[PDB]
Amino acid sequence: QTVRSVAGDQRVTDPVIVGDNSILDYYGGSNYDFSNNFEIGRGTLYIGKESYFSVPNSFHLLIKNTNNLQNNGQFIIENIKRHANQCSNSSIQVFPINFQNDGEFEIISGGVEGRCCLPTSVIAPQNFLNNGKFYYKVLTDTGSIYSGSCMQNVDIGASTTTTVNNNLWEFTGSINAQINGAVSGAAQINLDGSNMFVNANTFSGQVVNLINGGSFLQTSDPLSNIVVINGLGTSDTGVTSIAVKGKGKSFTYNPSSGIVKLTTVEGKTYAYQIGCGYNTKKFITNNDSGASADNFFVLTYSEPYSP
Ligand SMILES: [Gd]
Ligand SMILES: [Gd]
Ligand SMILES: [Gd]
Ligand SMILES: [Gd]
Ligand SMILES: [Gd]
Ligand SMILES: [Gd]
Ligand SMILES: [Gd]
Ligand SMILES: [Gd]
Ligand SMILES: [Gd]
Ligand SMILES: [Gd]
Ligand SMILES: [Gd]
Ligand SMILES: [Gd]
Ligand SMILES: [Gd]
Ligand SMILES: [Gd]
Ligand SMILES: [Gd]
Ligand SMILES: [Gd]
Ligand SMILES: [Gd]
Ligand SMILES: [Gd]
Ligand SMILES: [Gd]
Ligand SMILES: [Gd]
Ligand SMILES: [Gd]
Ligand SMILES: [Gd]
Ligand SMILES: [Gd]
Ligand SMILES: [Gd]
Ligand SMILES: [Gd]
Ligand SMILES: [Gd]
Ligand SMILES: [Gd]
Ligand SMILES: [Gd]
Ligand SMILES: [Gd]
Ligand SMILES: [Gd]
């Protein structure tokens, strides 16, 4: 049992080592820069605005030139705007070469009441391997889920990075998760009120679960694979949706396979496994036309989701 609790800005060039039953609490700094390896055992590494045990305007975390980030415990990044309401260039940038997450990796932002001013967030290790739980949550000052109009944009992966999910991702609240790199494995992605944008050409082995008005959007051309998407439906906790880039010509649902196909006027056909027991007559289809894809063909279903 060792607690370390360190206040103020940090430029850390030494290895970060958290032993079993230990806590390392970095807080109260506006600037954090780590450049060496991380080894987190059965303990907690916390980097945040306020102490793990509970004020600058800004929060900047950079992990860059780190060879290996090995997480076997809890790795928390927390940036809640409390009293503060100034708009700053707050950022979370996680670019280690190797990130192996066997435990819990949890990013928490939000607390925006007035001006819509959220941090830049990019999680793009060259090699990001998740065997554990990756959480991104947007919370109020009290720690409730934030579901307002100020959307936290999160970039996951990049054009040349490799991302593997073998367990769980869960994005909760007003989050736009832009999947900008190759993702593979065999895992669940839980979208609890959040949107996920499949921008890449490899997005494989991921079962997507839409909860509380969560949405799946693809901007890339149709994949080889048929993504399993659970939760299409309309309830009091909202309307979940599947959307593809372009202008929709038609849809077909096969009640015998549980596969829906969305065909665009360009003749691109997107296929998703939504499950059995849908009624064709209760599907709704809309072309959205505006501003990343200008246009989306949006599939919804008028009745509650039944597993
Ligand atoms: Gd040193
Ligand atoms: Gd030991
Ligand atoms: Gd040791
Ligand atoms: Gd140990
Ligand atoms: Gd030990
Ligand atoms: Gd040991
Ligand atoms: Gd500072
Ligand atoms: Gd070790
Ligand atoms: Gd060791
Ligand atoms: Gd060890
Ligand atoms: Gd150990
Ligand atoms: Gd906190
Ligand atoms: Gd936790
Ligand atoms: Gd706040
Ligand atoms: Gd506040
Ligand atoms: Gd594991
Ligand atoms: Gd927990
Ligand atoms: Gd947690
Ligand atoms: Gd927790
Ligand atoms: Gd973005
Ligand atoms: Gd962007
Ligand atoms: Gd969950
Ligand atoms: Gd790709
Ligand atoms: Gd797949
Ligand atoms: Gd939405
Ligand atoms: Gd109702
Ligand atoms: Gd189109
Ligand atoms: Gd086109
Ligand atoms: Gd629109
Ligand atoms: Gd964008």
Side-chain angles (χ1 to χ4, degrees), residues 1-41 43-56 58-85 87-293 295-307:
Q1 219 315 318
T2 93
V3 169
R4 269 181 292 160
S5 183
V6 186
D9 298 345
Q10 300 293 332
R11 177 63 197 103
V12 180
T13 57
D14 290 338
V16 174
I17 308 290
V18 185
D20 305 326
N21 207 224
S22 296
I23 308 168
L24 173 53
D25 170 38
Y26 292 107
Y27 76 99
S30 66
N31 286 79
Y32 294 99
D33 182 332
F34 298 85
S35 58
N36 213 322
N37 297 328
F38 295 54
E39 220 182 70
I40 307 158
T44 297
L45 171 59
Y46 172 100
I47 315 176
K49 192 171 258 158
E50 54 151 35
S51 177
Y52 181 84
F53 306 102
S54 269
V55 181
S58 197
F59 181 86
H60 313 262
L61 173 63
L62 178 61
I63 301 165
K64 181 171 251 133
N65 291 308
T66 296
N67 292 312
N68 295 295
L69 204 179
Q70 177 75 44
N71 181 34
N72 267 100
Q74 219 192 180
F75 177 17
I76 302 164
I77 304 167
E78 192 189 289
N79 179 35
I80 307 280
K81 195 178 285 205
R82 305 292 281 214
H83 309 133
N85 43 4
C87 272
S88 69
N89 199 17
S90 290
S91 49
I92 300 164
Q93 295 177 290
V94 181
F95 307 128
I97 298 181
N98 307 301
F99 184 176
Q100 190 176 135
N101 185 49
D102 282 20
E104 167 182 330
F105 175 50
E106 181 167 44
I107 306 182
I108 294 155
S109 67
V112 296
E113 314 140 338
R115 287 152 70 204
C116 175
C117 254
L118 285 174
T120 297
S121 301
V122 186
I123 304 97
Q126 178 56 43
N127 302 290
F128 180 21
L129 176 67
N130 181 49
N131 289 319
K133 296 158 159 43
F134 171 38
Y135 301 126
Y136 206 125
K137 305 185 183 176
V138 298
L139 293 189
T140 66
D141 288 12
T142 75
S144 70
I145 298 317
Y146 172 83
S147 295
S149 63
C150 189
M151 299 301 289
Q152 169 73 62
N153 198 276
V154 183
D155 296 342
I156 306 298
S159 200
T160 63
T161 71
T162 301
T163 301
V164 174
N165 185 20
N166 295 327
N167 186 345
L168 184 67
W169 296 355
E170 185 162 295
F171 304 138
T172 306
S174 289
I175 297 167
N176 286 325
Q178 301 283 346
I179 320 299
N180 293 341
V183 170
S184 68
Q188 309 281 310
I189 303 168
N190 287 349
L191 306 176
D192 186 345
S194 45
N195 306 315
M196 186 169 64
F197 295 77
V198 171
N199 304 318
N201 296 313
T202 302
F203 180 80
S204 77
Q206 311 300 298
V207 176
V208 180
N209 304 300
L210 310 178
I211 298 140
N212 297 326
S215 282
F216 173 96
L217 301 97
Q218 182 170 354
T219 66
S220 55
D221 289 351
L223 308 170
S224 312
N225 57 296
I226 302 183
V227 179
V228 175
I229 306 174
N230 299 311
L232 190 67
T234 295
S235 81
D236 291 322
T237 59
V239 185
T240 56
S241 67
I242 299 165
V244 302
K245 178 172 163 175
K247 306 161 178 167
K249 190 162 65 232
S250 64
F251 91 91
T252 63
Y253 171 70
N254 181 350
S256 297
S257 68
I259 298 176
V260 70
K261 305 174 158 182
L262 301 175
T263 299
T264 70
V265 300
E266 294 212 329
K268 289 173 192 178
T269 298
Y270 296 83
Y272 304 119
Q273 201 170 118
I274 58 167
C276 290
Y278 287 91
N279 174 3
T280 293
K281 309 216 163 186
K282 269 99 168 45
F283 285 106
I284 300 161
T285 252
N286 297 107
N287 286 322
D288 195 81
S289 69
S292 265
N295 306 293
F296 282 98
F297 180 38
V298 189
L299 181 69
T300 53
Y301 186 75
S302 62
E303 300 297 317
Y305 175 65
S306 336

